[PDB]
């Protein structure tokens, strides 16, 4: 089976786990646990980081037969090619690439404040940035079924993930964008996704690592 | 003709400018100038930022007919798909996706230090992290003619750009890695590339924007 290596949190592997369940992949998780504060012991991962035959050792990683991958986006793309979840036309391909890279910039905007020791002083300023972020995503989606067009694509998993994270931090953030509320519902009720979610191996939380000031659980 | 919008520096646009040149694309640059300290006035861009039809307005952007793109990586892939500059085997596509994402993370590691007011204090530690980064690139390349196989790829433009920046910062950083030196010469030897590098267009500098501690001139 395939091995998904990541920390015992949601973070960067969540859209991957989401994809791995929708696609019917057989896979298992190599969970790395992090030591409690203050030292946040990473030695469980650091001890085998350079022992896995990874070109650029990192988390998350994925092993599939002869293929050993890092970089979360590269893994998503790998799973997508094996299981018909890329864009076909040039129009979808452009939308995929722009949204894939944009999701990561949007995720890091948010990660950078929650992981900041000064999160509480920076929290009101970031909360007022969120309406325009979400509005970009609502205008991009428009009247489409999925973000790339008619068909489910791997970027939809990225989009659901980053939107989920923002709406956990700010439960009212999608309220003036009904088309994104309908997107999240439609995604959560695919069927392999509903089954995964209302199952025990669905990792609700923590959203982030232990040293984060929010969503560390 | 295609329109490439960026600041009047090297920055994130550099690999796009090379690929545009190498593919013989018909292109013009919309160059935005930024004010001097202390304001670093951005009005030349903010004047138009939201009036260009961009889904996620940003720099660099590319306007090609009806297609209006942002995200430097999406722009590179858009150009590559027009000229078959992407991998064809599943092994090549894996090497492309991993290196594309790795090159941005490595670029960002460097950009963060140079733009940090505390640059001088951070410089010693960052210098000692460079040998390990280059070793990983060196062993990834191996004896291959290019990073993805025997066929030039857009990710080669990214790897040249990021490696060029690190060797501009630390001139001895490729010394103990001969295969990376051969990669850089062979890349510069490309006829359309050398001709672009030999004309007073070539913005090898400034690496970064005016407010950077290093590479601002
Ligand atoms: N660009 C890479 C990022 C890889 C990465 O940063 N992994 C970190 C995650 S914690 C830092 C982190 C937390 C949360 C976010 N985020 O935006 O959600 C980003 C980075 C790690 O655990 N180990 C890397 C190592 O061995 O040095 C990817 O997308 O896979
Ligand atoms: N992920 C996007 C990043 C786009 C971006 O941040 N552009 C900045 C570049 S300056 C900040 C910057 C400098 C250098 C790097 N780098 O890695 O070298 C990254 C970001 C800008 O000028 N305007 C965006 C805006 O108007 O909001 C991409 O790759 O295109
Ligand atoms: Na499908
Ligand atoms: Na404006
Ligand atoms: Na080589």
Q: Are A148 and A95 in contact (CB under 8 A)?
A: yes
Residue A157 belongs to domain with CATH number: 1.20.1050.10
Give yes or no: residues A119 and A43 share one domain.
Answer: no
Separation between Cα atoms, residue A187 and residue A193, nearest integer Å? 7
- C-beta pairs of B168-173 under 8 Å, 24+ apart in sequence: B168/B204, B168/B207, B168/B215, B169/B110, B169/B214, B169/B215, B170/B127, B170/B130, B173/B130, B173/B131, B173/B134
Give yes or no: residues B94 and B74 share one domain.
Answer: no
Q: For residue B97, give how far its alpha carbon lies from the nearest alpha carbon of chain A (Å).
A: 5
- C-beta pairs of B171-174 under 8 Å, 24+ apart in sequence: B173/B130, B173/B131, B173/B134, B174/B134
Experimental method: X-ray
Q: How many CB atoms lie within 10 A of CB B137?
A: 24
Q: Are B179 and B134 in contact (CB under 8 A)?
A: no
Give the domain range for residue B53: 2-84
| Any ligand 1 atom below 6 A from CB of A62 | no
Separation between Cα atoms, residue B114 and residue B210, nearest integer Å? 11
Give yes or no: residues A106 and A66 share one domain.
Answer: no
Contacts of B33 (CB under 8 A, 6+ apart): B7, B8, B44
Phi, psi of B45 (to 5 degrees): -90, -50
Upper half-sphere CA count for residue A164 (Cβ side, 13 Å)? 19
* Top mutation candidate among A12, A30, A111, A112 for ligand 1, by most atoms within 8 Å of CB: A12
Give yes or no: residues B26 and B107 share one domain.
Answer: no
The ligand minimizing its distance to the Cα of B150 is: 5
Question: What Rg do the C-alpha atoms of chain A give, in angstroms?
Answer: 17
Separation between Cα atoms, residue B133 and residue B173, nearest integer Å? 10
**Pairing between strand B67-70 and B2-7?**
unpaired
- Conformational region of residue A91, where left means phi above 0, alpha means psi within -120 to 50, and beta covers everything else: alpha
| Any ligand 1 atom below 6 A from CB of A111 | yes
Does residue B103 form part of some domain?
Answer: yes
Q: How many CB atoms lie within 10 A of CB A68?
A: 17
Q: What is the DSSP letter of A92?
A: H
Binding residue per annotation — B72? yes
Does residue B59 form part of some domain?
Answer: yes
| Any ligand 2 atom below 6 A from CB of B102 | no
Q: What is the DSSP letter of B173?
A: T
CB-based burial, A151-184: b 16+ in 10 Å, e otherwise: ebbbbbbbbbbbbbbbbebbeebbeebeebeebe
Give yes or no: residues A129 and A67 share one domain.
Answer: no
The answer to whether the Cβ–Cβ distance between B56 and A102 falls below 8 Å is yes
Give me the DSSP letters along B94-106. Answer: HHHHHHHHHHHHH
Q: Are B179 and B81 in contact (CB under 8 A)?
A: no
Q: Of A84, A104, A136, at which residue does a domain stop?
A: A84
| Any ligand 1 atom below 6 A from CB of A71 | yes
Q: Are A165 and A110 in contact (CB under 8 A)?
A: yes
Q: Are B18 and B157 in contact (CB under 8 A)?
A: yes
Give yes or no: residues B94 and B39 share one domain.
Answer: no
Task: Report residue B15 CA to chain centroid gap.
Answer: 4
Cα dihedral A191→A69→B152→B80 (10° resolution): 30
Residues of B in contact with A55 (CB under 8 A): 98, 136, 139-140
Separation between Cα atoms, residue A27 and residue B198, nearest integer Å? 52
- Measured at the CA of B84, the angle between CA B54 and CA B70, to 5 degrees, comes to 15
Give the one of A72, A81, A140 whose C-beta lies nearest to B55's C-beta.
Answer: A140
Separation between Cα atoms, residue A75 and residue A62, nearest integer Å? 7
Residues of A in contact with B55 (CB under 8 A): 98, 136, 139-140
Does residue A157 form part of some domain?
Answer: yes
Separation between Cα atoms, residue B69 and residue A84, nearest integer Å? 24
Separation between Cα atoms, residue B11 and residue B98, nearest integer Å? 21
Give yes or no: residues A110 and A80 share one domain.
Answer: no
Separation between Cα atoms, residue A95 and residue B55, nearest integer Å? 10
Outline where DSSP puts E strands in B65-140.
Answer: 67-70
Q: Please state the domain count of chain A.
A: 2
- Nearest to B59, CA basis, from B102, B36, B29: B29
Separation between Cα atoms, residue A40 and residue B79, nearest integer Å? 44
Does residue A206 form part of some domain?
Answer: no
Give yes or no: residues A30 and A121 share one domain.
Answer: no
Binding residue per annotation — B10? no
Contacts of A39 (CB under 8 A, 6+ apart): none
Give yes or no: residues A35 and A102 share one domain.
Answer: no
Helix (H, G, I), strand (E, B) or coil at B206: coil
Residue A26 belongs to domain with CATH number: 3.40.30.10
Q: Are B69 and A140 in contact (CB under 8 A)?
A: no
């Amino acid at each position: 089976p395939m091995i998904l290596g990541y920390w015992d949190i949601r973070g960067l592997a969540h859209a991957i786990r989401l994809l791995l369940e929708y696609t019917g992949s057989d896979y298992e998780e190599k969970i790395y646990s992090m030591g409690d504060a203050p030292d946040y012991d990473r030695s469980q991962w650091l001890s085998e980081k350079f022992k896995l035959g990874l070109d650029f050792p990192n988390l998350p990683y994925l092993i599939d037969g002869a293929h050993r991958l890092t970089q979360s986006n590269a893994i998503l793309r790998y799973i997508a090619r094996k299981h018909n979840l890329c864009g076909e036309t040039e129009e979808e391909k452009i939308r995929v690439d722009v949204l894939e890279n944009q999701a990561m910039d949007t995720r890091l905007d948010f990660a950078r404040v929650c992981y900041n020791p000064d999160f509480e002083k920076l929290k009101p300023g970031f909360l007022k940035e969120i309406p325009e972020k979400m509005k970009l995503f609502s205008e991009f989606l428009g009247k489409r079924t999925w973000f790339a067009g008619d068909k489910l694509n791997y970027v939809d998993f990225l989009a659901y993930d980053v939107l989920d994270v923002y709406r956990i931090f700010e439960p009212k953030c999608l309220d003036e964008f009904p088309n994104l509320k309908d997107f999240m519902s439609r995604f959560e009720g695919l069927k392999k996704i509903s089954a995964y979610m209302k199952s025990s191996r669905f990792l609700r939380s923590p959203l982030f690592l232990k040293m984060a000031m929010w969503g560390n659980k």
